[PDB]
């Protein structure tokens, strides 16, 4: 099935040819374009006042790279290296050790914010939902040193909020 | 069309562009990769991996990583026969160490021999 | 006709006898080609089939709907290129037996 | 076997089998393999001398039109003496079918520069010359396109590693950008993912 | 929108498309968020007692490609496919 | 053993094409060192050119010599145009160290470079 | 929060002066909201 | 809840605090070493050791498909509490 | 971003060398050193304006090699987002042609509509533009409840807005004077120079990969592709706008023909399972673990497929060892194929007409690199 | 000494080299080239500035990721200076404006600045402190500049005696002062014999001396290779450039060699002449 274009002829009848001559010598559809643009002038423009009104989103945005923890409990991560096994720019760096207790844990959990393409594979790959892509996207960092997260920065960034992260997950733990 | 051809050797190392430091200093090794002993399956056999020897990997003084000045450090070339391996290594110029293939030795075991009468091969447990 | 759907190709006025002298030149240049190969057989068979399509039909639009290669003048251009391969395949001897073999451990894939 | 597994048509398989047998019979001078996969896409495997004759046949003849030209690449396979594989890909406007003309070649001997009959092959051949080094005699212009000018090494080979040998940085010493031997900031770790235990019993090659 | 009638008439006179009706400023039919939590379905597997993986093993149905002529009075000269039938102008307002 | 060479029959045509290519590089140098507003004497540039020629004099295989001639012709074209900038032309030179000598004891101080 | 504006102008914050002490009457940053209001203000919900 | 080494800065919940001869202390000049001030081992004694009347019992983690997977732990050690490797919270038996 | 060295007789031309390769990134090499599931976003972003049809072609390449058919709801949702991607790429090509030709404002009108479409992508996955979201093995993590009615609303309002775009332009007199006489293409040129899609629609031959070889459930919706007659750039513009309107048709019929099957395949050795069975299984946890570490093994062989990107024949050619890593991927790019014939398309015009020629074949200059 | 101060592997781009250098100045000319050659060596440079961060911003990306570090200093307090030199392997002192300001003379920058930094350095325990000086800065007349530099020379020689007191001649380069004044002319003609030394041999000598131990205690002086008349050099400048009071007195004052102290030859660096680099740098003339 096909529906092509540009198959006509200029009509040799006197009315159509004098109408094309009237458009040629009278600048008509140009003024029709001016009328359409003035109709968009008299609309109200759709802008948002940026520092006061922030643009809408989804409950599943991928931002901050925050961590979670157990209810009144310890660190949610096990250092099971799945996120570094899936990290498609290898920005995760995990060096693991157990502590004096016996449960297996970490030493070094580094996210490179340069290499992080923000897939979501480390969120989907985490069996205990330790790393969660965060809600807010404001990094804006004046120095390149400061864009290399440490595990303690991630724990502070996961302890500046969980209630946002918990609300988003508790809303959408059923799709994924 | 039935032209000059002369039966000689090959000198591709003046064409592949890798510098002569990495040509004459670094050394290759051709080996069948051994079975990773915790599993017992030899599908990881039947290939002849060509690798290069390891070199220095210091500490990255800001994050604790292992940087290296070695572009060739993560090469591997899985082959199918020792002859083409040696031919390619001599074709591309650098030196090479050949380790020979070692199959598992065929044995002679049986359950009735594990239930011997006056032979000491006895299961002693089951 | 009148202003066919292609672009760099204006309609011809005598398609039939032009196409027929094209295919008789195909038969001539095929008559140059030696006998025992089946290349002559397949080209002769398809050319006689297509000539039998065209000789039995003095129509235009029924001739397009029967003879494939829509609409019409692509058959003429394709006949020119078929003559081009005919001229290029007096030479180059495609029907003669093979030149030497690969080392035979090459076309098997899984390495 | 029927749900969530893609069914096939044996009719197209028989059609491509008969067509490939026909082409193999009527161009015997260069045909070595005519292989058909399970899902009916034809492969014709060709000696590197009948490039121009086979492509002049396959552009025409009113039984295999195949005007549409696609990819050209020469898949770098070691453990061979003829390393590189020039892969022509052809699509028929009239018949809706895909044939893969795989001709084989070595490192230094040219195949015969298909741009004479295929005007789409010009930058394809220039790309293959830039990335590999497969020379193309009787060609109008061979240059380096899709690489840097001062860079060399033919990087899509397997001998060229992942990182380049050179790495640029600006310096205020000579007030310009210079190239240095590569100083990576991290390793590009190498995961030995080639697991054993023979996931496909049908594709077993005979061992020694 | 949210404007008086004289300038509305000037908008509809400069463009007679009934601009007040659909204006690309969404007010009512924004999707009402915090939806009820969905329960996903599971498709034609987890079906007990019949799901032999031996059947639906599409990875292992990969045959090796069959071979015709090699390096080691016939009713023929068919096409690879039946020749393609020419289409039709669709009735839904073609040109012309 | 059938091998189709590029251009060569013996090394006579190899010598002929490489001496003509060196003549082209000789008349290539002063125009470029005037055009790119460079900062290097003509003697030093010509001596580094002939040093780069004298680096690969150890090749007797004629196909390799043909491919070297074709590569040098490519870069002579790309420098006789204005396609290559100041950066690549200085990148042929080495004015930024790179100080590494071939002494044993020097490589023994800054170690692990055998 | 007002209803008669469109979707994008419902929920707007008005920042105050020196909540951390950096003279933020002017030069108002982002992320000066607590996180539950960062759920509310980014239109992820319909309830305060 | 942190120690203060004779270097003089905040220690962490990993034994990685510095020596006096370091330059990394002086590259910490001007910007504070931010650390999580809510440690891990101290949030184990805060959790009460639960006592379940059964023998071979369950651990999930407070939520179906929200947490760590199921693990069934034993209580045959008469004086030693069962410890989930994932959770870190204890269990006892009451006959 | 390109380099163009043109040699011209005055306010006219003679020849032009497009120096391309400025935006070379090494994508095929990086995919040769990675797995399938990890290196899917390289296929997502080699082209960037069309963004989910590339996902669609790579996923159908892996499913066609792996002989596994997705569930039907996954197919219809993939058709819906392919139509969204088709609509988006054609409308951005129209607006960037308008902005480069002049014509400041309809750019911004249709980009407000595209801002609604990026809000839809956000609500689907979360990403603004480069949502991966299409695993090989069907669509992953399906849509939240309350999306299809929003797409219905967009369909009505966007039919109104595209009719207002044809109100503004299209019988614009001087834009017609600007682009009618330029860009002639012979059918022999359209065959030999290897053109793809919209050029073949515009110059002569009726040709659709979607219609001829239906690679999905496109065979069960009534639509009619617009064809060209004169082989011309204004004619090609009309072809693009009517392909957008056909995409409106296919969106309407797709919303009316939706079956509620399932998200992914029921073959857990290819697609990962979901969270409930993941947190209480054993086989599903093992499959999760090893499927994300190693990547599933792919049987050896070389396949090719091609779907209709809004540029043209987006082809992908996979070459697989029996492995979890592809041995060699390669991409047939309609941008590269369209840029290939620039001398013969612009032998007889001037430089602003050359800029209009670069406009009238939709360009991203990322996909032209391969 | 602790690890991560020992050298590691090859050189360049965050290869961990030996020295950790606290640099005073480095926003000017010679300090900027010195930070450049230490970044080529791959050495961590701690530099405090006092000015706007835009100047240290356009000399920022010389190092690799996070190698060099920026902080603050002032010419009044020992606390900020001591905080800048808390942990340092080596330290270099380069400072000085060639005209008096409202708040600083030629006195007390050259006098008061090495006093406090040498005080906190010797109380800190730094090694291989390199202090620059102008050549032939005497107790003699004609310059508050030269006599305050001689007082600073006596200070750095007396307290912390094993400092490398270094002096080049008047250096020329891309951002020279006196060749710029030769360009920024109008005139007058005098006589003075003079040897110019190019800047990159000077800073190569400084980095080689600071990375090579056992060469300490001795003051060094750098020598120009030509050593001819100033007015012939001005004619040379106008010829190569195609066109026909404190600074001019301090270039007409004194230019001699001193046989006491060792120079280039105890370091092993090739001397670049005036002619080659002068042809390289004399751009920006008429076409
Ligand atoms: N031919 C020559 O020019 C020769 C020069 N020298 C010496 O080399 C040194 C460097 O020369 P040059 O680069 O040309 O000159 P500069 O003035 O540019 O170098 C001095 C540096 O210290 C800073 N500085 C100077 N005075 C003060 C102050 N009162 N408070 C704070 N910072 C100050 C300068 O500016 P800022 O504060 O913005 O950082 C600059 O960073 C000088 O001491 C000079 O005597 C030696 C031999 C030859
Ligand atoms: C800025 C500077 C410009 C760039 C500088 C680098 C240019 C790089 C050019 C590279 C070209 C080459 O190196 S090809 C060198 C060819 N060498 C050979 O040995 C070829 C074979 N010929 C020979 O062996 C002999 O002809 C000899 C021994 C070289 C000469 O013998 P004559 O005596 O009978
Ligand atoms: S996948 Fe989750 S639990 Fe495992 S190492 Fe990564 S963050 Fe930790
Ligand atoms: S989102 Fe970032 S950290 Fe996570 S897998 Fe992707 S690149 Fe790695
Ligand atoms: Zn538990």
Break chain C into its structural domains and give their ranges: 1-111
Q: First and final CA of chain C: distance in angstroms?
A: 58
Q: Structure tokens of A112?
A: 């490179």
What's the burial of F9, exposed, middle or buried (CB within 10 Å: 0-12/13-18/19+)?
exposed
Which of these CATH numbers, 3.40.190.10, 3.30.70.3270, 3.20.20.60, 3.40.50.720, describes A64-175?
Answer: 3.30.70.3270
Q: First and final CA of chain J: distance in angstroms?
A: 56
Do B91 and B10 contact (CB within 8 A), yes or no?
yes
Distances (CA, A) of A109 to A80, A83, A106, D157, H27: 11, 11, 7, 35, 21
Do I234 and I176 contact (CB within 8 A), yes or no?
yes
I165: CB partners within 8 A, 6+ apart:
I106, I109, I110, I241
With CB atoms and an 8 Å threshold, state whether A93 touches B63.
Answer: yes
Q: Structure tokens of I213?
A: 């070889």
Neighbours of A38 (CB within 10 A): 14
Neighbours of E38 (CB within 10 A): 14
Which residues of chain J does B59 touch, with a Cβ-Cβ cutoff of 8 Å? 4, 8, 16
Cis peptide before C71 (omega within 30 of 0): yes
User: Nearest residue CA, atom 8 of ligand 4?
Assistant: A87
Cα–Cα distance for residue pair A39/A69, rounded to 1 Å: 55
Pairing of strands H90-93, H82-83: antiparallel
With CB atoms and an 8 Å threshold, state whether D186 touches A90.
Answer: yes
Strands across the sheet containing E66-68? D68-70, D84-91, D98-105, D42-46, D31-36, E66-68
Distances (CA, A) of B18 to D57, D146, D165: 42, 20, 7
> Which DSSP category does I306 fall into?
E
The phi, psi pair for H18, rounded to 5°, reads: -85, 175
Q: Which of E61, E66, E69 is facing D31, going by the closest CB pair?
A: E69
> Which DSSP category does J272 fall into?
P
Alpha helices in H1-95 (DSSP H): 24-27, 42-45
Cα–Cα distance for residue pair B77/B33, rounded to 1 Å: 11
> Which DSSP category does I239 fall into?
H
Cα–Cα distance for residue pair I290/I281, rounded to 1 Å: 15
Residues in chain D: 208
Half-sphere exposure of B122 (CA within 13 A, CB side): 7
3-state secondary structure labels for all residues of F64-90: HHHHHHHHHHHHHHHHHCCCCCHHHHH
Neighbours of F6 (CB within 10 A): 17
Half-sphere exposure of C99 (CA within 13 A, CB side): 14
Pocket probe mutation, ligand 3, options A80, A85, A151, A165, max atoms within 8 Å of Cβ = A80
User: Nearest residue CA, atom 4 of ligand 3?
Assistant: A80
Q: Given the structure tokens 């159908």, which residue do they identify?
A: I60
Cα–Cα distance for residue pair I75/I217, rounded to 1 Å: 7
Cα–Cα distance for residue pair I59/I61, rounded to 1 Å: 5
Q: Do chains C and I touch (3 or more CB pairs under 8 A)?
A: yes
Chains that touch H (3 or more CB pairs under 8 A): A, I, J
Give residue ranges with CB within 6 A of ligand 3: A 77-83, 94, 125-126, 128, 130-131
Neighbours of J165 (CB within 10 A): 21
User: Nearest residue CA, atom 17 of ligand 1?
Assistant: J97
> Which DSSP category does G7 fall into?
T
Nearest to I280 by CA among J173, A17, A151, H72: H72
Neighbours of H58 (CB within 10 A): 12
CA B4 to the chain's CA centroid: 37
Which residues of chain I does A29 touch, with a Cβ-Cβ cutoff of 8 Å? 171-173
> Which DSSP category does J264 fall into?
G
D43: CB partners within 8 A, 6+ apart:
D33, D34, D35, D36, D37, D99, D100, D102, E65, I302
Which residues of chain H does A105 touch, with a Cβ-Cβ cutoff of 8 Å? 40
Neighbours of E65 (CB within 10 A): 18
3-class SS at A96? Answer: coil
Identify the contact set of chain E against chain D, taking CB-CB distances under 8 A: 43-45, 55-56, 58-71, 76-81, 83-84
Q: Structure tokens of A159?
A: 């302890």
Which residues of chain I does C5 touch, with a Cβ-Cβ cutoff of 8 Å? 204-205, 227, 229
Neighbours of C33 (CB within 10 A): 15
CA torsion I149-I152-I153-I158 (nearest 10°) is 160
Half-sphere exposure of I31 (CA within 13 A, CB side): 26
User: What's the domain count of chain F?
Assistant: 1
Residues in chain G: 48
List % helix, strand, coil for chain H (3-state, nearest 5): 10, 20, 70
Do D66 and D129 contact (CB within 8 A), yes or no?
no
Regarding the beta carbon of J132 and ligand 1, being less than 6 Å apart is answered yes
**Shortest alpha-carbon distance between residue D147 and chain I (Å):** 7
Do G7 and G13 contact (CB within 8 A), yes or no?
no
Q: Which residues pair with A92 in a beta bridge?
A: A111
3-state secondary structure labels for all residues of chain C: CCCCCCCCCCCCCCHHHHHHHHHHHHHHHHHHCCCCCCHHHHHHHHHHHHHHHHHCCCCCHHHHHHCCCCCCHHHHHHHHHHHHHHHHCCCCCCCCCCCCCCCCCCCCCCC
What is the H or E stretch that residue J280 is in?
helix J274-281
Nearest to J240 by CA among J174, J179, J177: J179
Instruction: Please give the full DSSP string across F23-40, using - where no structure is assigned.
Output: HHHHTTHHHHHHHTT--S
Cα–Cα distance for residue pair I298/I301, rounded to 1 Å: 9
* J246 torsion bin: left (phi>0), alpha (psi -120 to 50), beta (else): alpha
Residues in chain B: 126
Do B26 and F113 contact (CB within 8 A), yes or no?
no
Which residues of chain D does F86 touch, with a Cβ-Cβ cutoff of 8 Å? 176
Nearest to D175 by CA among F41, J58, J174: J174
Q: Which domain holds residue B81?
A: 4-126
Compute the distance from residue D160 Cα to the ligand 1 centre, in Å.
48
Instruction: Please give the full DSSP string across A139-152, using - where no structure is assigned.
Output: ---S-SGGGEE-HH
Q: Which of G7, G28, G35 is facing A164, going by the closest CB pair?
A: G35
What is the H or E stretch that residue I181 is in?
none
Which residues of chain J does H25 touch, with a Cβ-Cβ cutoff of 8 Å? 86-87
Chain H contact present for A152, CB below 8 A: yes
Chain D contact present for C6, CB below 8 A: no
Q: Given the structure tokens 């199959």, which residue do they identify?
A: B103
User: Nearest residue CA, atom 48 of ligand 1?
Assistant: J170
Chains that touch C (3 or more CB pairs under 8 A): D, E, I
Do I321 and C110 contact (CB within 8 A), yes or no?
yes
Nearest to E86 by CA among C74, J170, G33: C74
Name the packing angle between helices J144-158 and J112-122 (round to 10°): 10
Cα–Cα distance for residue pair I192/B3, rounded to 1 Å: 33
With CB atoms and an 8 Å threshold, state whether E80 touches D21.
Answer: no
User: What's the domain count of chain B?
Assistant: 1
Nearest to J131 by CA among J143, J119, J118: J118
From the candidates C3, C4, C8, which should be mutated to test the interface with I, based on the most I CB atoms within 10 A? C8
The three-point CA angle A94-A97-A101 to 5° equals: 140
Sign of CA dihedral A4, A5, A6, A7: positive
J104 Cα nearest atom in ligand 1: 29
Cis peptide before E96 (omega within 30 of 0): yes
Closest listed ligand to the CA of F40: 2
Do I94 and I289 contact (CB within 8 A), yes or no?
no
With CB atoms and an 8 Å threshold, state whether E71 touches C104.
Answer: yes
């Amino acid at each position: 099935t096909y529906k092509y274009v540009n198959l006509r002829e200029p009509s040799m009848d006197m009315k159509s040819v004098t109408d094309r001559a009237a458009q040629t010598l009278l600048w008509t559809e140009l003024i029709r374009g001016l009328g359409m643009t003035l109709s968009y002038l008299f609309r109200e423009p759709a802008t948002i006042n940026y520092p006061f009104e922030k643009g809408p989103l989804s409950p599943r945005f991928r931002g901050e790279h925050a961590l979670r923890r157990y209810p009144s409990g310890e660190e949610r991560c096990i250092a099971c290296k799945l996120c570094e096994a899936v990290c498609p720019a290898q920005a995760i760096t995990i060096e693991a050790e157990p502590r004096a207790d016996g449960s297996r844990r970490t030493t070094r959990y580094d996210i490179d914010m340069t290499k992080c393409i923000y897939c979501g594979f480390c969120q989907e790959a985490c069996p205990v939902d330790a790393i969660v892509e965060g809600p807010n996207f404001e990094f804006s960092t004046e120095t390149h040193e400061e864009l290399l997260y440490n595990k303690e920065k991630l724990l502070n960034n996961g302890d500046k909020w969980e209630a946002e992260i918990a609300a988003n997950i508790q809303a959408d733990y059923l799709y994924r | 069309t039935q032209l000059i051809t002369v039966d000689e050797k090959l000198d591709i190392t003046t064409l592949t562009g890798v510098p002569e430091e990495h040509i004459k200093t670094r050394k290759a090794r051709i080996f069948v990769p051994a079975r990773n002993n915790m599993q017992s399956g030899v599908n990881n056999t039947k290939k002849w991996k060509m690798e290069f020897d390891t070199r220095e990997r210091w500490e990255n003084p800001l994050m604790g990583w292992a940087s290296t000045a070695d572009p060739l450090s993560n090469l591997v070339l899985t082959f199918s026969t020792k002859e083409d391996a040696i031919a390619f290594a001599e074709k591309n110029g650098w030196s090479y160490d050949v380790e020979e293939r070692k199959v598992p030795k065929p044995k002679s075991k049986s359950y009735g021999a594990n239930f011997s009468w006056n032979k000491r091969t006895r299961v002693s447990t089951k | 006709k009148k202003t066919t759907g292609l672009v760099g190709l204006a309609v011809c006025e005598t398609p039939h006898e032009r196409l027929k002298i094209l295919y008789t030149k195909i038969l001539d240049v095929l008559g140059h080609i030696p006998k025992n190969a089946a290349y002559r057989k397949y080209t002769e068979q398809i050319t006689n089939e297509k000539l039998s399509i065209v000789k039995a039909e003095p129509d235009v639009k029924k001739l397009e709907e029967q003879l494939q290669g829509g609409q019409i003048e692509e058959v003429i251009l394709q006949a020119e290129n078929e003559l081009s391969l005919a001229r290029k395949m007096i030479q180059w001897k495609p029907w003669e037996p093979l030149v030497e073999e690969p080392p035979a451990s090459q076309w098997k894939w899984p390495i | 076997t029927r749900p969530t597994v893609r069914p096939r048509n044996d009719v197209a398989h028989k059609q491509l089998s008969a067509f490939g047998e026909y082409v193999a019979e009527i161009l015997p001078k260069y045909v070595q393999q005519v292989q058909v996969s399970c899902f009916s896409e034809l492969e014709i495997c060709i000696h590197p001398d009948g490039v121009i004759p086979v492509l002049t046949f396959l552009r025409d003849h009113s039984n295999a039109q195949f005007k549409s030209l696609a990819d050209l690449t020469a898949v770098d396979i070691p453990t061979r003496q003829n390393r590189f594989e020039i892969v022509y890909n052809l699509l028929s406007l009239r018949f809706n079918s895909r044939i893969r003309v795989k001709t084989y070649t070595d490192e230094l001997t040219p195949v015969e520069s298909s741009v004479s009959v295929y005007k789409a092959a010009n930058w394809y051949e220039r790309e293959i010359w830039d990335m590999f080094g497969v020379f193309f005699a009787n060609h109008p212009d061979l240059r380096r396109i899709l690489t840097d000018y001062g860079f060399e090494g033919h990087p899509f080979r397997k001998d060229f590693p992942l990182s380049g040998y050179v790495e640029l940085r600006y310096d205020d010493e000579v007030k310009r950008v210079v190239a240095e031997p590569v100083e990576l900031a991290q390793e590009f770790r190498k995961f030995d993912l080639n697991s054993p235990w023979e996931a496909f019993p049908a594709y077993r090659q005979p061992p020694e | 929108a949210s404007a008086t009638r004289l300038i509305q008439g000037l908008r509809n006179w400069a463009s007679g498309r009934d601009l007040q009706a659909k204006l690309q400023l969404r007010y009512q039919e924004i999707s009402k968020r915090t939806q009820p939590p969905p329960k996903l379905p599971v498709g034609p597997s987890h079906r007990l007692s019949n799901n032999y993986y031996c059947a639906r093993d599409g990875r292992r149905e990969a045959m090796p490609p069959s071979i015709v002529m090699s390096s080691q009075s016939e009713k023929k000269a068919v096409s690879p496919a039946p020749p393609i039938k020419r289409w039709e102008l669709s009735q839904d307002e073609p040109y012309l | 053993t059938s091998v189709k060479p590029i251009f060569s029959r013996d090394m006579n045509e190899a010598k002929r094409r490489v001496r003509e290519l060196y003549r082209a590089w000789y008349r290539e140098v002063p125009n470029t060192v005037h055009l790119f507003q460079l900062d290097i004497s003509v003697k030093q540039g010509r001596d580094k050119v002939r040093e780069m020629f004298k680096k690969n004099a150890h090749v007797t295989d004629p196909r390799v010599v043909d491919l070297l001639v074709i590569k040098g012709k490519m870069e002579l074209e790309e420098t006789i145009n204005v396609w290559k900038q100041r950066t690549h032309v200085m990148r042929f030179f080495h004015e930024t160290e790179a100080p590494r000598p071939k002494d044993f004891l020097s490589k023994f101080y800054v170690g692990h470079d055998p | 929060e007002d209803n008669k504006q469109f979707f994008g102008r419902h929920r707007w914050v008005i920042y105050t002066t020196e909540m951390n002490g950096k003279n933020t009457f002017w030069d108002v940053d982002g992320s000066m909201v607590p996180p539950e209001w960062h759920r509310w203000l980014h239109c992820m919900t319909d309830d305060p | 809840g942190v120690r203060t080494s004779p270097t003089g800065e905040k220690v962490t919940h990993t034994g990685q605090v510095y020596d006096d001869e370091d330059y990394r202390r002086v590259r910490f000049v001007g910007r504070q070493k931010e650390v999580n001030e809510n440690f891990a081992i101290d949030l184990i004694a805060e959790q009460p050791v639960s006592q379940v009347g059964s023998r071979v019992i369950s651990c999930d983690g407070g939520g179906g498909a929200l947490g760590h997977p199921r693990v069934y732990i034993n209580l045959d050690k008469e004086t030693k509490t069962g410890t989930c490797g994932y959770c870190g919270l204890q269990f006892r038996q009451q006959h | 971003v390109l380099r163009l060295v043109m040699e011209l007789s005055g306010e006219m031309v003679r020849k032009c060398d497009p120096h391309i390769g400025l935006l070379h990134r090494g994508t095929e090499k990086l995919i040769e050193y990675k797995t399938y599931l990890q290196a899917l976003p390289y296929f997502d972003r080699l082209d960037y304006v069309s963004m989910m049809c590339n996902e669609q072609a790579y996923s159908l390449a892996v499913e066609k090699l792996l002989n596994i058919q997705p569930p039907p709801r996954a197919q219809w949702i993939r058709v819906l987002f392919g139509e969204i991607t088709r609509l988006l790429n054609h409308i951005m090509a129209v607006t960037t042609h308008a902005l480069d030709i002049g014509a400041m404002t309809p750019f911004f009108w249709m980009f407000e509509e595209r801002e609604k479409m990026f809000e839809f992508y956000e609500r689907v996955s979360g990403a603004r533009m480069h949502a991966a979201y299409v695993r090989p093995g069907g669509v992953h993590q399906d849509l939240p409840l309350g999306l299809m009615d929003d797409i219905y609303e967009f369909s009505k309002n966007f039919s109104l807005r595209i009719d207002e775009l044809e109100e503004m332009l299209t019988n614009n007199r001087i834009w017609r004077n600007r682009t009618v006489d330029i860009g002639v293409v012979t059918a022999e040129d359209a065959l030999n120079y290897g053109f793809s899609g919209v050029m073949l629609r515009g110059s002569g031959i009726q040709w659709d990969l979607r219609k001829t070889q239906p690679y999905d459930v496109y065979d069960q919706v009534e639509f009619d592709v617009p064809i060209g007659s004169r082989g011309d750039c204004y004619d090609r513009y009309l072809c693009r706008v009517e392909e957008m309107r056909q995409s409106i048709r296919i969106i309407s019929q797709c919303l009316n023909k939706m079956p509620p099957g399932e998200i992914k395949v029921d073959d857990a050795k290819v697609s990962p399972p979901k969270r409930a069975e993941m947190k209480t299984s054993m086989e599903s946890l093992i499959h999760h673990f090893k499927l994300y570490t190693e990547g599933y093994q792919v049987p050896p062989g070389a396949t090719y497929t091609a779907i209709e990107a809004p540029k043209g024949e987006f082809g992908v050619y996979l070459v697989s060892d029996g492995s979890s890593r592809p041995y060699r991927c390669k991409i047939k790019a309609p941008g590269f194929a369209h840029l290939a014939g620039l001398d013969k398309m612009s032998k007889g015009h001037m430089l602003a007409d050359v800029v209009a020629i670069i406009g009238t074949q939709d360009i991203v200059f990322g996909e032209v690199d391969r | 000494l602790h690890h991560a101060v020992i050298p590691h592997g090859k050189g360049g781009r965050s290869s961990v080299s030996g020295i950790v250098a606290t640099v005073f100045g480095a926003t000017g000319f010679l300090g900027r080239y010195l930070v450049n050659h230490l970044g080529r060596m791959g050495s961590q440079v701690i530099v405090p500035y006092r000015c706007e961060p835009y100047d240290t911003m356009h000399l920022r990306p010389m190092g690799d990721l996070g190698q060099i570090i920026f902080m603050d200093w002032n010419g009044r307090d020992k606390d900020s200076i001591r905080r800048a030199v808390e942990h340092s392997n080596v330290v270099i002192n380069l400072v000085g404006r060639e005209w008096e300001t409202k708040n600083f003379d030629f006195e007390d920058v050259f006098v008061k600045i090495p006093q406090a930094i040498a005080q906190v350095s010797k109380e800190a325990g730094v090694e291989k402190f390199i202090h620059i000086s102008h050549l032939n800065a005497d107790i003699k007349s004609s310059s508050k500049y030269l006599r305050n530099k001689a007082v600073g020379e006596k200070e750095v020689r007396e307290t912390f005696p094993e400092a490398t007191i270094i002096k080049p001649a008047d250096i020329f380069g891309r951002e020279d002062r006196f060749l710029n004044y030769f360009a920024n002319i109008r005139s007058l003609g005098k006589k003075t014999v003079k040897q110019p030394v190019y800047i990159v041999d000077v800073t190569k000598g400084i980095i080689n001396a600071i990375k090579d131990p056992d060469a300490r205690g001795k003051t060094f002086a750098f020598v120009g290779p030509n050593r001819y008349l100033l007015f012939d050099l001005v004619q040379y400048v106008f010829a190569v450039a195609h066109r026909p009071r404190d600074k001019v007195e301090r270039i007409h004052t004194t230019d001699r060699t001193l046989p006491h102290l060792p120079g280039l030859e105890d370091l092993g660096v090739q001397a670049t002449p005036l002619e080659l680099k002068a042809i390289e740098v004399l751009r920006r003339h008429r076409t």
